[PDB]
Amino acid sequence: FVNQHLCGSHLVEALYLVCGERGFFYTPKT
Amino acid sequence: FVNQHLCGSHLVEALYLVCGERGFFYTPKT
Amino acid sequence: FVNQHLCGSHLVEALYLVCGERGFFYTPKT
Amino acid sequence: FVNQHLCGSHLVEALYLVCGERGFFYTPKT
Amino acid sequence: FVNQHLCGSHLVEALYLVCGERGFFYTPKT
Amino acid sequence: FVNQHLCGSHLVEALYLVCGERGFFYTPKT
Amino acid sequence: GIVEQCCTSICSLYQLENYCN
Amino acid sequence: GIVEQCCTSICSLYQLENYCN
Amino acid sequence: GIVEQCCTSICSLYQLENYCN
Amino acid sequence: GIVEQCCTSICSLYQLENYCN
Amino acid sequence: GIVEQCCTSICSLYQLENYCN
Amino acid sequence: GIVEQCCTSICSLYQLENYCN
Ligand SMILES: [Cl-]
Ligand SMILES: [Cl-]
Ligand SMILES: [Zn+2]
Ligand SMILES: [Zn+2]
């Protein structure tokens, strides 16, 4: 895999692809 | 606003939209 | 809901989620 | 170009692509 | 059609819409 | 990581994610 | 409408342009 | 859970807020 | 307008809702 | 091909890497 | 190339079409 | 954190994987 530059919803899509059925938590600063 | 089917990455995108900086958890296993 | 920073197609996806079956119009400047 | 099924947010994303600055209407009720 | 300003995955989605069943190759620099 | 169904534009988005700067080919005809 | 044309059935990018302003 | 609420069945944006932190 | 506002500044879902048909 | 591997059936992210250049 | 052009400048669907298989 | 790192810098899929449940 390659490193990623992901902002906004692109990060959420990446988390979704990476975590699959496990799901994930999205926790921005502030 | 509406009620719709939101599945998969679209569901997490919607969560991103709705929650934003609060963050969110996507836990399909429950 | 949280405020949104949406550019490009992200705005269209947000409109789609917000308007559901009502649909929407997308009307950029110029 | 091709003919494909474009549904839901993918349909509006395609409209964004195709129309861009012209803007577009997405009116699923007709 | 309108000209496009597409970065990141937005370009890939545009390629997907444009090429349909033909598919496509995505070939960034470097 | 997980195994999931990845279809259509989501498949190419996943390829973008996974391949990035390597680039990739999406060739649905085989 | 557009959903019938492009989702239920299939449409080209030119048909999609029918729904531009 | 969320999938049952919003994908299998339908949910509003307010119900989606149930899954915010 | 909204397309610019949301991108150069911020906008709310409620402002967006004004653009539904 | 990729569609059979990853859409019709399921694939891992490593299998997706099979289609990188 | 196209990936850069579309992002740093603009590109057309027609230019994109060149990248189909 | 990760949300900032991936956007202002870069992050790996492996770093992301830490955020799965
Ligand atoms: Cl973006
Ligand atoms: Cl879908
Ligand atoms: Zn989809
Ligand atoms: Zn984007």
Domain layout of chain B by residue ranges: 1-30
| Residue B10 alpha carbon to ligand 4 centre in Å | 14
Task: Determine phi and psi for A2, rounding to 5 degrees.
Answer: -105, 155
Residues β-bridged to residue J20:
F24
Determine the distance separating the centroid of ligand 1 and the alpha carbon of A7, expressed in angstroms.
7
To what resolution in angstroms was this structure determined?
1.5
Discontinuities after residues in chain D (C–N over 2.5 A) = none
CB L12 within 8 A of CB A4: yes
Beta bridge partners of L11: A4
Please report the beta strands in D1-30, taking only residues with DSSP state E, as ranges in sequence order.
Answer: 3-4, 24-26
CB L11 within 8 A of CB A15: no
Q: Which of D17, D19, D20 sits opposite E17 (nearest CB)?
A: D17
The technique by which this structure was obtained is X-ray
Beta bridge partners of C4: I11
* CA angle (E21, E23, E25) in 5-degree steps: 175
DSSP state of H20: B
Q: Is G20 helix (H, G, I), strand (E, B) or coil?
A: strand
**CA B15 to mean position of chain CA atoms:** 3
Contact residues on chain A for E9, CB-CB shorter than 8 A: 10, 13
